[PDB]
Design an enzyme around this catalytic site. Sequence first.
Site, PDB file in Angstrom:
ATOM      1  CD1 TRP A 127     -16.485 -76.733  38.932  1.00  0.00           C
ATOM      2  CD2 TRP A 127     -16.990 -78.082  37.218  1.00  0.00           C
ATOM      3  NE1 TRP A 127     -16.699 -75.947  37.823  1.00  0.00           N
ATOM      4  CE2 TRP A 127     -17.008 -76.749  36.757  1.00  0.00           C
ATOM      5  CE3 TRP A 127     -17.277 -79.113  36.312  1.00  0.00           C
ATOM      6  CZ2 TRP A 127     -17.306 -76.419  35.430  1.00  0.00           C
ATOM      7  CZ3 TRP A 127     -17.572 -78.784  35.000  1.00  0.00           C
ATOM      8  CH2 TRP A 127     -17.584 -77.449  34.571  1.00  0.00           C
ATOM      9  CG  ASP A 208     -13.100 -83.116  35.421  1.00  0.00           C
ATOM     10  OD1 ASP A 208     -12.508 -82.589  34.455  1.00  0.00           O
ATOM     11  OD2 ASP A 208     -14.052 -82.551  35.997  1.00  0.00           O
ATOM     12  CB  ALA A 210     -10.346 -79.380  33.794  1.00  0.00           C
ATOM     13  CE  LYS A 243     -11.081 -74.495  33.540  1.00  0.00           C
ATOM     14  NZ  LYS A 243     -11.711 -75.789  33.757  1.00  0.00           N
TER      15      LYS A 243
END
Lengths: 394, 388
Positions: A127, A208, A210, A243
């Site tokens: 990302w 991470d 997400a 999300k």
Amino acid sequence: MLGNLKPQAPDKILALMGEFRADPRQGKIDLGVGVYKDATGHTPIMRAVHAAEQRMLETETTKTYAGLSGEPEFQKAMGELILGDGLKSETTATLATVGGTGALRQALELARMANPDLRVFVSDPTWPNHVSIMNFMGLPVQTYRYFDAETRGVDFEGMKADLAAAKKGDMVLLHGCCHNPTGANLTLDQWAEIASILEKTGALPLIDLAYQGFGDGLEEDAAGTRLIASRIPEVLIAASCSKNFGIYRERTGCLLALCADAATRELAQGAMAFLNRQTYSFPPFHGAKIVSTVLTTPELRADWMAELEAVRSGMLRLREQLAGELRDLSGSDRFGFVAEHRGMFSRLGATPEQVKRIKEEFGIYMVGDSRINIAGLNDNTIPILARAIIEVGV
Amino acid sequence: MLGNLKPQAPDKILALMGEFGKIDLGVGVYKDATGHTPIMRAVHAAEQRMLETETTKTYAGLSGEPEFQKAMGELILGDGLKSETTATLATVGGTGALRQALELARMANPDLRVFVSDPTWPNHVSIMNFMGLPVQTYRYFDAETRGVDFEGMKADLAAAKKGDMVLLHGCCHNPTGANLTLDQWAEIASILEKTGALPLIDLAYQGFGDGLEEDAAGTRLIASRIPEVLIAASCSKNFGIYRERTGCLLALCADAATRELAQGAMAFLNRQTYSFPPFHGAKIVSTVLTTPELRADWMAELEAVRSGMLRLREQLAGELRDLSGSDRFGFVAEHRGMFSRLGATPEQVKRIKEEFGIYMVGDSRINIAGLNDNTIPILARAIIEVGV
Ligand SMILES: *Cc1c(COP(=O)(O)O)cnc(C)c1O
Ligand SMILES: *Cc1c(COP(=O)(O)O)cnc(C)c1O
Ligand SMILES: O=C(O)CCc1c[nH]c2ccccc12
């Protein structure tokens, strides 16, 4: 004085949408979107979420300053959602943050405090925000192989050789699941090996998280994070509720610090609270309260898991479809990876020229690195995408 | 790695909060006659409406919503808002606005120095220490009279070089409660202009001093005299939405070109810190501000709070005078905002904490909102029973 300021580059995304809107083509398509969009091209507010805000509106009597490092109800709920039964509260420090990005920023800040000579290892690719934040902080960044441009899968051997170079105190950033942008992921057996590289080198892993719930399921997607948390003494996790809870703009996330012992945990918790205080003081309450209300209220938790699973299955059927169409159009195995990938993004492995060709000849828009949003597809668009891919010689 | 974490010092004001006839007189939150920090009527109606109108929670504006930015600029600068040369940034509370303000300043000037008032909000020096910025103080509080040591203030400010930043409170000075008059502000504007220093105005209590428009008078004066100023605003107190974390940074520039730079650097600054700013609080504010019915009721309620407190300071001052026969504690009725520095010595301050139970900040900072007809005589009695 402000004239000495250097021009900072635009968000880029806005420019991307700018070109799309200008296109006078009737049947243009947009797979560049980075958010979830349903069958009608909308980003719906989850039923459970709307129910939580409703409950909140009836019970919240005050809006006075609350917890500096977040509210217990939230910290516990998140810790259990991610770690499950393995949550060793005694050694876990938690910090409510301004979204996953806030968690990431703070994670980098904390580690740099404990070790000024911190070096960061990030996947190739990863990302974009990762690199920018680190660049902004002035942290030295190193890359480790990940995406195999040929098979669109994980170049595990390369990832291994490169990670071996990491040393004591370095930070290895890992996506817990649904690798953004690629979509290619590590298997539990690959996570176990990575764990061994991490134990050997003594590097600190930063996970991470997400997209928990967009891959194979809530528990399934946390499997890797849990394998690491079980074998590695110190682990940093940056979770996002943007999300999987569909509350992007609320800015809800949290930093989890797994420590080897209690004394260290108290040292980490204190340092974390210090970080919030010096940046923006208390963290945003609203989203964090929507989340803890859903997770603690059985009726709401049930309806939330149900809705998310609907989302996950929907995207999966879409992958299967796309891949199926591609099998007919090419008569080969080649694009089978589309059904193997997990998450809402996938890198087709097309070159910038091919990406341009597709846009100009088929009116289909996608990120320059050939990253597409599966959620943007549908029974009508898939035929067009598939044909385009084959036609441009991918 | 984490075992190398050096233990960090805590926030005294919030520390007492945890340690807390047990009368709370610390944290700068507003409280009603029954010790409650209620939700404002308009805010409650705003949330209710939002619950019905909002159909999506997708990512929004990186620098904040345009509706929020416009409303905020008009609330602060009124008709002095030149949007063509003003850049706005929605932040995480007023504190985030201050931090972002310091980041932007240092970005434009690596050799930046910051002037703060003696004394000022502790968090100011805290953040600046963390950032590693040189902190200098200017005389402000006149220890004896509890007023402003203006002559001392002017003398110190005159020593500021250009490219330096001066942190001024727009109104309701924390922790003193002592504030400058409009004439003094014009004086400060003169100095700032001659020295070339950039004023950073901390505006956290607009509506608690003399009124919404009046409390902004000073900020508006500087905005008209100085071509470039930064204003860090907080919606926590005057909207009573503390936990939502909402405020904004206004960067006033001498031209549109510079404005575009600042705006760009401000957004980039949000992107590198936490991406998008919190929506909910910003939305409540804009809804209120743009809904005539809502703004009307909000103003009315805020006027009620403001008048009630002034009423309280007046009662307390009265009792203090009628408990010693002296105009000593007259400063109480002069000060503006919800705080006031009693000028009490630390021995006395810490003393009254136990046998009495009245928790006030170690520097004798008392939250007037914590007082009430029942507690006033006890406090006055305490002040006399102790030392001063
Ligand atoms: C989406 C995403 C995030 C989330 O950022 P937020 O601040 O929660 O909006 C973090 N990391 C990655 C890799 C992401 O894809
Ligand atoms: C309240 C306050 C702030 C801002 O507080 P936030 O909770 O971050 O909105 C800033 N400065 C002073 C002097 C304050 O009293
Ligand atoms: O008491 C005050 O000064 C205002 C509330 C307050 C105390 N510590 C703080 C730290 C950050 C933001 C707000 C506060």
